[PDB]
Short mmCIF file of C-alpha atoms and ligand atoms in Angstrom, two decimals:
data_model
loop_
_atom_site.label_atom_id
_atom_site.label_comp_id
_atom_site.label_asym_id
_atom_site.label_seq_id
_atom_site.Cartn_x
_atom_site.Cartn_y
_atom_site.Cartn_z
CA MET U 1 27.06 -20.56 -18.40
CA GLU U 2 25.19 -18.71 -15.26
CA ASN U 3 25.68 -21.84 -13.27
CA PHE U 4 29.36 -21.90 -13.73
CA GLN U 5 32.43 -20.18 -12.10
CA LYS U 6 35.48 -20.38 -14.54
CA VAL U 7 38.37 -21.07 -12.35
CA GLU U 8 41.26 -21.37 -15.40
CA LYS U 9 41.76 -21.54 -18.89
CA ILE U 10 42.75 -25.10 -19.67
CA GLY U 11 43.36 -24.37 -23.18
CA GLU U 12 42.36 -23.17 -26.61
CA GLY U 13 40.99 -25.04 -29.81
CA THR U 14 40.16 -24.30 -33.08
CA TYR U 15 36.55 -24.64 -31.95
CA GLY U 16 37.13 -22.25 -28.96
CA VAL U 17 38.38 -21.73 -25.41
CA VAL U 18 38.35 -24.58 -22.80
CA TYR U 19 37.69 -23.62 -18.84
CA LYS U 20 38.34 -25.48 -16.03
CA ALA U 21 34.95 -24.62 -14.05
CA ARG U 22 32.97 -25.37 -10.90
CA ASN U 23 29.26 -26.18 -10.94
CA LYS U 24 27.81 -23.26 -8.74
CA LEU U 25 25.15 -25.62 -7.44
CA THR U 26 26.67 -29.26 -7.64
CA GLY U 27 30.12 -28.17 -7.31
CA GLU U 28 31.29 -30.58 -9.66
CA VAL U 29 34.27 -29.53 -11.31
CA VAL U 30 34.03 -29.85 -15.15
CA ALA U 31 35.71 -28.67 -18.32
CA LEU U 32 33.83 -25.92 -19.91
CA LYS U 33 34.22 -25.70 -23.94
CA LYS U 34 32.86 -22.49 -25.55
CA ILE U 35 32.37 -23.04 -29.16
CA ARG U 36 32.96 -19.95 -31.32
CA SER U 37 20.81 -27.24 -36.28
CA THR U 38 22.59 -29.96 -37.52
CA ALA U 39 25.61 -29.42 -35.46
CA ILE U 40 23.07 -29.70 -32.58
CA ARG U 41 21.89 -33.27 -33.78
CA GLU U 42 25.44 -34.43 -34.19
CA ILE U 43 26.40 -33.22 -30.56
CA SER U 44 23.36 -34.70 -29.14
CA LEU U 45 24.47 -38.30 -30.55
CA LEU U 46 28.05 -37.69 -28.93
CA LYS U 47 26.29 -37.58 -25.35
CA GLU U 48 25.18 -41.11 -25.93
CA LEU U 49 28.61 -42.27 -26.77
CA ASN U 50 29.59 -43.33 -23.25
CA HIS U 51 32.92 -45.61 -22.77
CA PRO U 52 35.69 -45.48 -20.05
CA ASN U 53 38.26 -44.47 -22.60
CA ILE U 54 36.07 -41.50 -23.94
CA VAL U 55 36.03 -38.12 -22.01
CA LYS U 56 32.28 -38.13 -21.05
CA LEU U 57 30.11 -35.16 -22.42
CA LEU U 58 28.08 -34.01 -19.55
CA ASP U 59 25.91 -31.48 -21.00
CA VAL U 60 25.35 -29.29 -23.92
CA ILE U 61 24.00 -25.76 -23.11
CA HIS U 62 22.63 -23.83 -26.14
CA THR U 63 21.67 -20.56 -24.57
CA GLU U 64 21.67 -16.83 -25.98
CA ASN U 65 22.80 -18.93 -29.19
CA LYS U 66 26.25 -19.71 -27.88
CA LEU U 67 27.14 -23.17 -27.47
CA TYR U 68 28.95 -24.68 -24.59
CA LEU U 69 29.75 -28.30 -23.97
CA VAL U 70 30.62 -29.45 -20.53
CA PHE U 71 33.03 -32.51 -20.12
CA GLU U 72 34.32 -34.51 -17.60
CA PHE U 73 37.38 -33.12 -16.29
CA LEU U 74 40.94 -34.47 -16.36
CA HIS U 75 44.19 -32.84 -14.67
CA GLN U 76 46.62 -33.69 -17.25
CA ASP U 77 47.12 -34.34 -20.98
CA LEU U 78 49.60 -36.62 -22.78
CA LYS U 79 51.28 -33.97 -24.26
CA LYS U 80 52.03 -32.59 -20.92
CA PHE U 81 52.86 -35.97 -19.90
CA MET U 82 55.47 -36.29 -22.64
CA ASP U 83 57.33 -33.17 -22.04
CA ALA U 84 57.54 -34.25 -18.33
CA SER U 85 59.02 -37.62 -19.28
CA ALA U 86 61.27 -36.27 -22.02
CA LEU U 87 64.32 -36.90 -19.75
CA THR U 88 63.84 -40.75 -18.99
CA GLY U 89 61.05 -41.38 -21.60
CA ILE U 90 57.34 -43.01 -20.56
CA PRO U 91 58.52 -46.50 -19.66
CA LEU U 92 57.30 -49.18 -22.07
CA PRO U 93 54.70 -50.97 -20.04
CA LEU U 94 52.74 -47.55 -19.75
CA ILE U 95 53.13 -46.91 -23.32
CA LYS U 96 51.64 -50.06 -23.95
CA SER U 97 48.66 -50.03 -21.68
CA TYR U 98 47.75 -46.23 -22.84
CA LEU U 99 47.61 -47.60 -26.50
CA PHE U 100 45.74 -50.59 -25.53
CA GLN U 101 43.22 -48.50 -23.95
CA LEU U 102 43.06 -45.71 -26.69
CA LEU U 103 42.79 -48.71 -29.21
CA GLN U 104 39.79 -49.68 -26.93
CA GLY U 105 38.18 -46.30 -27.17
CA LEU U 106 38.55 -46.24 -30.97
CA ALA U 107 37.14 -49.75 -31.37
CA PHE U 108 33.91 -48.44 -29.37
CA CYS U 109 33.41 -45.34 -31.43
CA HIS U 110 34.51 -46.99 -34.87
CA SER U 111 31.76 -49.60 -34.19
CA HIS U 112 29.17 -46.84 -34.15
CA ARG U 113 30.64 -45.21 -36.90
CA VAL U 114 31.57 -42.33 -35.25
CA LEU U 115 35.67 -40.88 -36.02
CA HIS U 116 37.66 -38.68 -34.11
CA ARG U 117 39.36 -37.32 -37.14
CA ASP U 118 41.74 -35.05 -35.34
CA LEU U 119 43.86 -37.12 -32.76
CA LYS U 120 46.81 -35.62 -31.27
CA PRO U 121 48.53 -35.75 -27.64
CA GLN U 122 46.94 -32.48 -26.66
CA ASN U 123 43.44 -34.38 -26.85
CA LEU U 124 44.44 -37.47 -25.11
CA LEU U 125 43.83 -37.18 -21.12
CA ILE U 126 45.21 -39.16 -18.43
CA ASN U 127 44.38 -39.57 -14.90
CA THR U 128 46.25 -40.59 -11.52
CA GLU U 129 44.75 -44.34 -11.91
CA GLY U 130 46.67 -44.59 -15.12
CA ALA U 131 43.58 -44.31 -17.48
CA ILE U 132 43.80 -42.22 -20.84
CA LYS U 133 40.85 -40.98 -22.47
CA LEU U 134 40.01 -39.52 -26.00
CA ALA U 135 38.71 -35.82 -25.94
CA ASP U 136 36.85 -33.87 -28.31
CA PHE U 137 35.64 -37.11 -30.17
CA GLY U 138 33.02 -36.41 -33.22
CA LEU U 139 33.34 -32.93 -33.08
CA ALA U 140 35.21 -32.21 -36.39
CA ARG U 141 32.02 -33.78 -38.29
CA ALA U 142 30.11 -31.36 -35.84
CA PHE U 143 31.48 -28.56 -37.76
CA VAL U 144 46.25 -26.28 -36.86
CA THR U 145 48.67 -29.24 -36.49
CA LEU U 146 49.10 -31.71 -39.34
CA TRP U 147 51.87 -34.04 -37.85
CA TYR U 148 48.99 -36.57 -37.15
CA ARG U 149 47.17 -36.40 -40.32
CA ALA U 150 46.70 -39.66 -42.70
CA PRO U 151 47.90 -39.24 -45.90
CA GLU U 152 44.63 -39.98 -47.78
CA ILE U 153 43.24 -36.64 -46.16
CA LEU U 154 46.31 -34.97 -47.39
CA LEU U 155 46.02 -36.28 -50.88
CA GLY U 156 42.31 -34.70 -50.69
CA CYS U 157 40.03 -38.00 -50.31
CA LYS U 158 36.82 -36.45 -49.17
CA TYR U 159 35.12 -39.51 -48.00
CA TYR U 160 38.01 -40.98 -45.84
CA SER U 161 37.56 -43.65 -43.35
CA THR U 162 37.97 -44.89 -39.64
CA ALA U 163 41.53 -45.75 -41.13
CA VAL U 164 42.61 -42.06 -40.53
CA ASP U 165 42.25 -42.45 -36.58
CA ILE U 166 44.58 -45.64 -36.67
CA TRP U 167 47.04 -43.48 -38.53
CA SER U 168 47.01 -40.48 -35.91
CA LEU U 169 47.39 -43.04 -33.01
CA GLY U 170 50.27 -44.73 -34.73
CA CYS U 171 52.09 -41.62 -35.14
CA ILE U 172 51.67 -40.82 -31.24
CA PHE U 173 52.63 -44.45 -30.53
CA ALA U 174 56.11 -43.69 -32.36
CA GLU U 175 56.30 -40.17 -30.61
CA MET U 176 56.01 -41.91 -27.05
CA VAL U 177 58.69 -44.71 -27.95
CA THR U 178 61.09 -42.37 -29.45
CA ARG U 179 60.14 -38.66 -27.56
CA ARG U 180 60.06 -36.96 -30.76
CA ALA U 181 57.18 -36.09 -33.21
CA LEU U 182 57.20 -39.02 -35.81
CA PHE U 183 56.28 -36.28 -38.95
CA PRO U 184 56.36 -32.93 -37.91
CA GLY U 185 55.04 -31.23 -41.00
CA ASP U 186 54.79 -27.36 -41.02
CA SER U 187 52.68 -27.25 -44.24
CA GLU U 188 50.82 -29.62 -46.07
CA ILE U 189 53.62 -30.44 -48.82
CA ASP U 190 56.12 -30.71 -45.97
CA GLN U 191 53.80 -33.19 -43.95
CA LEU U 192 53.39 -35.32 -47.16
CA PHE U 193 57.26 -35.08 -48.21
CA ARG U 194 58.22 -36.24 -44.59
CA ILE U 195 55.62 -39.17 -44.87
CA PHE U 196 57.22 -40.15 -48.11
CA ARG U 197 60.98 -39.74 -46.98
CA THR U 198 60.43 -42.23 -44.26
CA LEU U 199 57.92 -44.36 -45.47
CA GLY U 200 58.71 -44.58 -49.38
CA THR U 201 56.73 -42.43 -52.28
CA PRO U 202 53.49 -44.24 -52.37
CA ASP U 203 52.79 -46.04 -55.92
CA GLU U 204 50.11 -48.14 -57.43
CA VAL U 205 51.93 -51.16 -56.03
CA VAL U 206 51.73 -50.49 -52.32
CA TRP U 207 48.43 -48.23 -52.72
CA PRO U 208 46.25 -49.11 -55.68
CA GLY U 209 44.25 -45.79 -56.80
CA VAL U 210 46.87 -43.43 -55.14
CA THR U 211 47.69 -41.73 -58.47
CA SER U 212 44.21 -40.99 -59.10
CA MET U 213 43.78 -38.97 -55.95
CA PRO U 214 42.87 -35.16 -56.10
CA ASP U 215 46.05 -33.92 -54.87
CA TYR U 216 48.68 -36.51 -56.10
CA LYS U 217 51.25 -35.32 -58.60
CA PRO U 218 53.18 -37.45 -61.14
CA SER U 219 55.73 -34.74 -60.07
CA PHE U 220 56.19 -35.89 -56.30
CA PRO U 221 59.82 -36.91 -55.50
CA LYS U 222 60.43 -40.71 -55.56
CA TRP U 223 62.02 -41.50 -52.23
CA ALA U 224 62.76 -44.98 -51.05
CA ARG U 225 61.32 -46.48 -47.91
CA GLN U 226 63.33 -46.88 -44.85
CA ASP U 227 63.69 -49.82 -42.23
CA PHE U 228 61.27 -49.55 -39.18
CA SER U 229 64.31 -50.27 -36.89
CA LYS U 230 65.74 -46.93 -37.94
CA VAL U 231 62.47 -45.19 -37.25
CA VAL U 232 61.33 -46.20 -33.77
CA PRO U 233 64.35 -48.07 -31.83
CA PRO U 234 64.47 -49.30 -29.64
CA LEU U 235 60.90 -50.98 -29.85
CA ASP U 236 60.75 -54.62 -30.05
CA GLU U 237 59.61 -56.48 -33.11
CA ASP U 238 55.91 -57.15 -32.05
CA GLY U 239 55.88 -53.42 -31.29
CA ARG U 240 57.31 -52.52 -34.62
CA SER U 241 55.30 -54.82 -36.57
CA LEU U 242 52.08 -53.39 -35.03
CA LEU U 243 53.15 -49.96 -35.48
CA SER U 244 54.02 -51.14 -39.35
CA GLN U 245 50.43 -51.96 -39.69
CA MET U 246 48.99 -48.74 -38.23
CA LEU U 247 51.09 -46.73 -40.93
CA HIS U 248 49.87 -48.75 -43.99
CA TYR U 249 49.44 -46.05 -46.69
CA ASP U 250 46.37 -48.10 -48.21
CA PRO U 251 43.42 -47.37 -45.78
CA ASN U 252 42.12 -50.81 -46.63
CA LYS U 253 45.17 -52.59 -45.78
CA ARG U 254 45.70 -50.35 -42.41
CA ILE U 255 45.05 -52.64 -39.50
CA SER U 256 41.63 -51.84 -37.77
CA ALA U 257 41.35 -50.87 -34.08
CA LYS U 258 39.65 -54.18 -33.07
CA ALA U 259 42.29 -56.31 -34.89
CA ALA U 260 45.13 -54.43 -33.52
CA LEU U 261 43.63 -55.19 -29.78
CA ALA U 262 44.49 -58.92 -30.66
CA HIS U 263 48.01 -58.33 -31.82
CA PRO U 264 50.75 -60.23 -29.99
CA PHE U 265 52.20 -56.86 -28.82
CA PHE U 266 49.62 -56.76 -26.18
CA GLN U 267 50.05 -60.56 -24.68
CA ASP U 268 51.52 -58.85 -21.78
CA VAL U 269 49.60 -55.84 -21.40
CA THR U 270 49.20 -54.64 -17.76
CA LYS U 271 47.91 -51.37 -16.25
CA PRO U 272 50.64 -49.50 -14.72
CA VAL U 273 49.87 -45.92 -12.78
CA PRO U 274 51.86 -43.10 -13.77
CA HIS U 275 53.69 -40.55 -11.35
CA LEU U 276 52.01 -37.44 -12.08
CA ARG U 277 52.54 -34.06 -10.61
CA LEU U 278 49.42 -31.83 -10.26
C1 LIG R 301 39.84 -30.36 -23.15
C2 LIG R 301 38.65 -30.98 -23.14
C3 LIG R 301 37.90 -31.80 -22.27
C4 LIG R 301 38.75 -31.64 -20.89
N1 LIG R 301 38.47 -32.35 -19.75
N2 LIG R 301 39.61 -32.05 -18.88
C5 LIG R 301 40.56 -31.50 -19.50
C6 LIG R 301 39.99 -31.19 -20.91
C7 LIG R 301 40.42 -30.17 -21.85
#
Protein backbone atom coordinates (compact mmCIF):
# COMPACT_ATOMS: atom_id res chain seq x y z
CA MET A 1 0.00 0.00 0.00
CA GLU A 2 3.06 2.16 0.14
CA ASN A 3 2.36 3.41 -3.40
CA PHE A 4 -0.84 5.22 -2.52
CA GLN A 5 -2.01 8.22 -0.54
CA LYS A 6 -5.47 7.72 0.98
CA VAL A 7 -7.52 10.84 0.26
CA GLU A 8 -10.78 9.75 1.82
CA LYS A 9 -13.08 6.93 2.94
CA ILE A 10 -15.60 6.11 0.19
CA GLY A 11 -17.22 3.52 2.41
CA GLU A 12 -17.27 0.32 4.40
CA GLY A 13 -18.46 -3.07 3.25
CA THR A 14 -18.70 -6.42 4.98
CA TYR A 15 -15.34 -7.25 3.42
CA GLY A 16 -13.63 -4.05 4.48
CA VAL A 17 -13.11 -0.34 3.98
CA VAL A 18 -12.90 1.46 0.63
CA TYR A 19 -10.69 4.50 0.15
CA LYS A 20 -10.38 7.03 -2.61
CA ALA A 21 -6.64 7.07 -3.18
CA ARG A 22 -3.93 8.52 -5.45
CA ASN A 23 -1.17 6.45 -6.98
CA LYS A 24 1.93 8.29 -5.65
CA LEU A 25 3.73 7.48 -8.91
CA THR A 26 1.11 7.51 -11.72
CA GLY A 27 -1.22 9.90 -9.92
CA GLU A 28 -4.13 7.83 -11.14
CA VAL A 29 -7.01 8.03 -8.71
CA VAL A 30 -8.51 4.73 -7.78
CA ALA A 31 -10.69 3.18 -5.14
CA LEU A 32 -8.63 1.10 -2.78
CA LYS A 33 -10.39 -1.73 -0.95
CA LYS A 34 -8.78 -3.26 2.15
CA ILE A 35 -9.99 -6.83 2.63
CA ARG A 36 -10.20 -7.73 6.31
CA SER A 37 -5.06 -19.12 -1.62
CA THR A 38 -8.34 -20.13 -3.26
CA ALA A 39 -9.54 -16.55 -2.69
CA ILE A 40 -6.37 -15.47 -4.52
CA ARG A 41 -7.12 -17.62 -7.55
CA GLU A 42 -10.77 -16.43 -7.68
CA ILE A 43 -9.85 -12.79 -7.39
CA SER A 44 -7.34 -13.13 -10.22
CA LEU A 45 -9.99 -14.53 -12.53
CA LEU A 46 -11.96 -11.36 -11.81
CA LYS A 47 -9.10 -9.29 -13.17
CA GLU A 48 -9.88 -10.80 -16.54
CA LEU A 49 -13.62 -10.11 -16.63
CA ASN A 50 -13.56 -6.73 -18.25
CA HIS A 51 -16.71 -5.02 -19.58
CA PRO A 52 -17.73 -1.28 -19.80
CA ASN A 53 -20.54 -1.99 -17.32
CA ILE A 54 -18.25 -3.64 -14.80
CA VAL A 55 -16.06 -1.49 -12.44
CA LYS A 56 -12.57 -2.47 -13.62
CA LEU A 57 -10.36 -4.31 -11.09
CA LEU A 58 -7.01 -2.60 -11.85
CA ASP A 59 -4.75 -4.51 -9.51
CA VAL A 60 -4.54 -6.89 -6.57
CA ILE A 61 -1.91 -6.36 -3.89
CA HIS A 62 -1.13 -9.25 -1.57
CA THR A 63 1.55 -7.87 0.71
CA GLU A 64 2.59 -8.32 4.32
CA ASN A 65 -0.30 -10.80 4.16
CA LYS A 66 -3.09 -8.28 3.69
CA LEU A 67 -5.21 -8.04 0.56
CA TYR A 68 -5.89 -4.81 -1.38
CA LEU A 69 -8.02 -4.51 -4.48
CA VAL A 70 -7.40 -1.47 -6.72
CA PHE A 71 -10.54 -0.51 -8.67
CA GLU A 72 -11.43 2.01 -11.27
CA PHE A 73 -12.85 5.02 -9.41
CA LEU A 74 -16.32 6.55 -9.96
CA HIS A 75 -17.68 9.57 -8.09
CA GLN A 76 -21.22 8.47 -7.32
CA ASP A 77 -23.36 5.42 -6.54
CA LEU A 78 -27.02 4.81 -7.40
CA LYS A 79 -28.03 5.02 -3.74
CA LYS A 80 -26.76 8.54 -3.51
CA PHE A 81 -28.15 9.25 -6.97
CA MET A 82 -31.68 8.08 -5.69
CA ASP A 83 -31.72 10.09 -2.47
CA ALA A 84 -30.72 13.09 -4.59
CA SER A 85 -33.54 12.44 -7.13
CA ALA A 86 -36.29 11.65 -4.57
CA LEU A 87 -38.28 14.89 -4.97
CA THR A 88 -38.81 14.50 -8.69
CA GLY A 89 -37.62 10.87 -9.20
CA ILE A 90 -35.22 9.56 -11.87
CA PRO A 91 -36.70 10.21 -15.34
CA LEU A 92 -37.97 7.03 -17.02
CA PRO A 93 -35.59 7.27 -20.01
CA LEU A 94 -32.63 7.25 -17.61
CA ILE A 95 -34.09 4.48 -15.46
CA LYS A 96 -34.50 2.51 -18.64
CA SER A 97 -30.91 3.16 -19.84
CA TYR A 98 -29.54 2.18 -16.40
CA LEU A 99 -31.48 -1.14 -16.39
CA PHE A 100 -30.38 -1.90 -19.98
CA GLN A 101 -26.68 -1.30 -19.16
CA LEU A 102 -26.79 -3.40 -15.94
CA LEU A 103 -28.54 -6.21 -17.83
CA GLN A 104 -25.66 -5.97 -20.33
CA GLY A 105 -23.13 -6.26 -17.50
CA LEU A 106 -25.00 -9.24 -16.07
CA ALA A 107 -25.33 -10.98 -19.45
CA PHE A 108 -21.49 -10.75 -19.71
CA CYS A 109 -20.61 -12.12 -16.24
CA HIS A 110 -23.33 -14.75 -16.45
CA SER A 111 -22.06 -16.06 -19.76
CA HIS A 112 -18.65 -16.48 -18.03
CA ARG A 113 -20.44 -18.22 -15.13
CA VAL A 114 -19.62 -15.51 -12.57
CA LEU A 115 -22.44 -14.33 -10.33
CA HIS A 116 -22.56 -11.14 -8.30
CA ARG A 117 -24.71 -12.49 -5.42
CA ASP A 118 -24.98 -9.15 -3.64
CA LEU A 119 -26.41 -6.50 -5.95
CA LYS A 120 -27.65 -3.38 -4.20
CA PRO A 121 -27.89 0.30 -5.00
CA GLN A 122 -24.65 1.09 -3.08
CA ASN A 123 -22.57 -1.06 -5.39
CA LEU A 124 -23.95 0.43 -8.63
CA LEU A 125 -21.65 3.29 -9.65
CA ILE A 126 -22.51 6.06 -12.11
CA ASN A 127 -20.53 8.68 -14.07
CA THR A 128 -21.20 12.08 -15.74
CA GLU A 129 -21.40 10.30 -19.13
CA GLY A 130 -24.56 8.38 -18.21
CA ALA A 131 -22.73 5.10 -17.61
CA ILE A 132 -23.69 2.72 -14.80
CA LYS A 133 -21.32 -0.04 -13.59
CA LEU A 134 -21.46 -3.10 -11.33
CA ALA A 135 -19.01 -2.94 -8.36
CA ASP A 136 -17.83 -5.86 -6.15
CA PHE A 137 -18.65 -8.48 -8.77
CA GLY A 138 -17.49 -12.02 -7.90
CA LEU A 139 -16.17 -11.12 -4.44
CA ALA A 140 -18.85 -13.06 -2.53
CA ARG A 141 -17.67 -16.40 -3.89
CA ALA A 142 -14.10 -15.19 -3.30
CA PHE A 143 -14.96 -15.38 0.43
CA VAL A 144 -26.03 -6.54 6.01
CA THR A 145 -28.95 -5.65 3.72
CA LEU A 146 -31.48 -8.40 2.84
CA TRP A 147 -33.72 -6.14 0.75
CA TYR A 148 -32.44 -7.45 -2.58
CA ARG A 149 -32.03 -11.16 -1.70
CA ALA A 150 -33.71 -13.72 -3.97
CA PRO A 151 -36.31 -16.06 -2.26
CA GLU A 152 -34.39 -19.27 -3.12
CA ILE A 153 -31.43 -17.92 -1.08
CA LEU A 154 -33.77 -17.09 1.82
CA LEU A 155 -35.39 -20.56 1.60
CA GLY A 156 -31.92 -22.12 2.02
CA CYS A 157 -30.98 -23.28 -1.50
CA LYS A 158 -27.19 -23.82 -1.33
CA TYR A 159 -26.74 -24.22 -5.06
CA TYR A 160 -28.47 -21.15 -6.46
CA SER A 161 -28.04 -19.65 -9.95
CA THR A 162 -27.39 -16.46 -11.94
CA ALA A 163 -31.16 -15.99 -11.45
CA VAL A 164 -30.40 -14.48 -8.02
CA ASP A 165 -28.86 -11.42 -9.78
CA ILE A 166 -31.94 -10.86 -12.00
CA TRP A 167 -34.03 -10.89 -8.83
CA SER A 168 -31.95 -8.19 -7.11
CA LEU A 169 -31.93 -6.08 -10.24
CA GLY A 170 -35.73 -6.34 -10.46
CA CYS A 171 -35.98 -5.07 -6.90
CA ILE A 172 -33.74 -2.12 -7.81
CA PHE A 173 -35.73 -1.33 -10.99
CA ALA A 174 -38.93 -1.10 -8.90
CA GLU A 175 -37.11 1.12 -6.34
CA MET A 176 -35.98 3.57 -9.02
CA VAL A 177 -39.54 3.80 -10.38
CA THR A 178 -41.37 4.21 -7.07
CA ARG A 179 -38.62 5.90 -4.95
CA ARG A 180 -39.16 3.41 -2.13
CA ALA A 181 -37.45 0.06 -1.55
CA LEU A 182 -39.58 -2.82 -2.84
CA PHE A 183 -39.03 -5.36 0.01
CA PRO A 184 -37.23 -3.69 2.95
CA GLY A 185 -36.84 -6.68 5.29
CA ASP A 186 -35.14 -6.17 8.63
CA SER A 187 -34.67 -9.87 9.23
CA GLU A 188 -34.77 -13.06 7.19
CA ILE A 189 -38.36 -13.90 8.05
CA ASP A 190 -39.49 -10.29 7.69
CA GLN A 191 -37.84 -10.23 4.24
CA LEU A 192 -39.46 -13.49 3.15
CA PHE A 193 -42.83 -12.44 4.51
CA ARG A 194 -42.75 -9.05 2.76
CA ILE A 195 -42.07 -10.94 -0.49
CA PHE A 196 -45.07 -13.24 0.23
CA ARG A 197 -47.43 -10.34 1.06
CA THR A 198 -46.81 -8.69 -2.32
CA LEU A 199 -46.28 -11.67 -4.64
CA GLY A 200 -48.29 -14.38 -2.85
CA THR A 201 -47.01 -17.20 -0.66
CA PRO A 202 -45.33 -19.52 -3.17
CA ASP A 203 -46.69 -23.07 -3.58
CA GLU A 204 -46.14 -26.10 -5.79
CA VAL A 205 -48.32 -24.62 -8.56
CA VAL A 206 -46.13 -21.55 -9.11
CA TRP A 207 -42.82 -23.04 -7.91
CA PRO A 208 -42.45 -26.85 -8.20
CA GLY A 209 -40.10 -28.07 -5.46
CA VAL A 210 -40.59 -25.05 -3.19
CA THR A 211 -42.22 -27.09 -0.36
CA SER A 212 -39.07 -29.30 -0.20
CA MET A 213 -36.61 -26.42 0.33
CA PRO A 214 -34.52 -26.47 3.48
CA ASP A 215 -36.16 -23.55 5.36
CA TYR A 216 -39.59 -23.76 3.81
CA LYS A 217 -42.29 -24.34 6.53
CA PRO A 218 -45.87 -25.62 5.95
CA SER A 219 -46.78 -23.13 8.65
CA PHE A 220 -45.97 -20.03 6.49
CA PRO A 221 -49.01 -17.75 6.30
CA LYS A 222 -50.93 -17.95 3.03
CA TRP A 223 -51.13 -14.45 1.48
CA ALA A 224 -52.75 -13.69 -1.90
CA ARG A 225 -50.76 -12.11 -4.73
CA GLN A 226 -51.19 -8.42 -5.53
CA ASP A 227 -51.52 -6.86 -8.96
CA PHE A 228 -48.41 -5.21 -10.29
CA SER A 229 -50.25 -2.01 -11.15
CA LYS A 230 -50.47 -1.55 -7.38
CA VAL A 231 -46.79 -2.47 -6.88
CA VAL A 232 -45.05 -0.05 -9.25
CA PRO A 233 -47.33 2.63 -10.61
CA PRO A 234 -47.01 4.52 -12.79
CA LEU A 235 -44.79 2.15 -14.81
CA ASP A 236 -46.22 1.25 -18.21
CA GLU A 237 -47.23 -2.26 -19.29
CA ASP A 238 -43.99 -3.18 -21.01
CA GLY A 239 -42.10 -2.27 -17.84
CA ARG A 240 -44.50 -4.11 -15.50
CA SER A 241 -44.36 -7.13 -17.78
CA LEU A 242 -40.55 -7.18 -17.71
CA LEU A 243 -40.46 -6.57 -13.94
CA SER A 244 -42.93 -9.42 -13.47
CA GLN A 245 -40.61 -11.80 -15.28
CA MET A 246 -37.54 -10.71 -13.27
CA LEU A 247 -39.52 -11.45 -10.08
CA HIS A 248 -40.72 -14.98 -10.96
CA TYR A 249 -40.52 -17.23 -7.91
CA ASP A 250 -39.16 -20.27 -9.75
CA PRO A 251 -35.49 -19.52 -10.63
CA ASN A 252 -35.93 -21.61 -13.77
CA LYS A 253 -38.84 -19.52 -15.00
CA ARG A 254 -37.17 -16.19 -14.05
CA ILE A 255 -36.05 -14.23 -17.15
CA SER A 256 -32.36 -14.41 -18.09
CA ALA A 257 -30.27 -11.20 -18.56
CA LYS A 258 -29.79 -11.92 -22.30
CA ALA A 259 -33.54 -12.53 -22.82
CA ALA A 260 -34.46 -9.42 -20.84
CA LEU A 261 -32.28 -7.41 -23.24
CA ALA A 262 -34.73 -8.40 -26.02
CA HIS A 263 -37.88 -7.40 -24.18
CA PRO A 264 -40.18 -4.75 -25.81
CA PHE A 265 -39.52 -2.33 -22.93
CA PHE A 266 -36.09 -1.72 -24.50
CA GLN A 267 -37.54 -0.86 -27.93
CA ASP A 268 -36.85 2.85 -27.45
CA VAL A 269 -33.77 2.77 -25.23
CA THR A 270 -31.54 5.83 -25.30
CA LYS A 271 -28.57 6.98 -23.21
CA PRO A 272 -29.40 10.20 -21.33
CA VAL A 273 -26.83 11.84 -19.05
CA PRO A 274 -27.64 12.55 -15.47
CA HIS A 275 -27.23 15.88 -13.73
CA LEU A 276 -24.72 14.90 -11.04
CA ARG A 277 -23.36 17.23 -8.38
CA LEU A 278 -19.84 16.19 -7.35
C1 LIG B 1 -16.58 0.76 -4.07
C2 LIG B 1 -15.90 -0.06 -4.94
C3 LIG B 1 -15.30 0.48 -6.06
C4 LIG B 1 -15.38 1.85 -6.31
N1 LIG B 1 -14.90 2.66 -7.31
N2 LIG B 1 -15.26 3.95 -7.12
C5 LIG B 1 -15.96 3.99 -5.98
C6 LIG B 1 -16.08 2.69 -5.43
C7 LIG B 1 -16.67 2.12 -4.30
